[PDB]
Amino acid sequence: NATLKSLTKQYLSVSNSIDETVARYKAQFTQLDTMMSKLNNTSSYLTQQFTAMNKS
Amino acid sequence: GSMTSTVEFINRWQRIALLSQSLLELAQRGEWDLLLQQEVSYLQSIETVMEKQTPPGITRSIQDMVAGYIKQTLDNEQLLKGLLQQRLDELSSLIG
Known part of the structure; x- marks a missing residue:
């Protein structure tokens, strides 16, 4: 037996949280x-760096 | 003078590998907000080895040591991509 206004406030408050x-x-x-x-981009760069680091 | 330049070089790459492990573990622990914060630093650390060059005269032993950090970073990144996709799917379901 809560007021409609009170229920509507709670309804809207929960709706806003959602x-x-x-x-x-x-x-x-x-x-x-x-x-x-x-x-994807960094892995591509890092793969290049690995091979460069390994050369010589 | 340049014994400083070798350690700095080493530290640049170790930082990248560090942040890469940090990201992976944060993802493993479901810490998505912190992951995205940490991502910022990770990208900055990649930029650092783009702006600064491998110094002349790095020995084979040190090159091998750093190559190990680069490989570990790639390995972590690969694992991370899977955890990210999983989270993206988790989120699509939540979003509806």
């Missing part, structure tokens, strides 16, 4: 994916 949580996950997904692509 939105903020999902926003966070999307940002983290994007940055981890960026990181993963960047590892």
Whole structure:
């Protein structure tokens, strides 16, 4: 028997937390994916460095 | 003078290998926010061996020592890519 207004406030508050949580996950997904692509480039450079370090 | 230049050279590459292990372990422990912070340093440390050259007169023994750090960094990076993909999949599911 809580008031509708009170229930609606809680509803919206929890809804906002969900939105903020999902926003966070999307940002983290994007940055981890960026990181993963960047590892492709660094590995390519490091492979070159390894062989150069081994020459002579 | 240049015994300093050899250790600095050695330290540049050891730092890269260090940060590479740090990233891997942070990923293993599911510490994704710290991983992304540490990533910043890792990339900066790669840039350092691009801006500075291998000095002349590094012996074979030291070249071998550093080659070991480079190999270890590659090994870690490879493992890391798998953990990252797994996390990306975990996140897609959470995101919906």
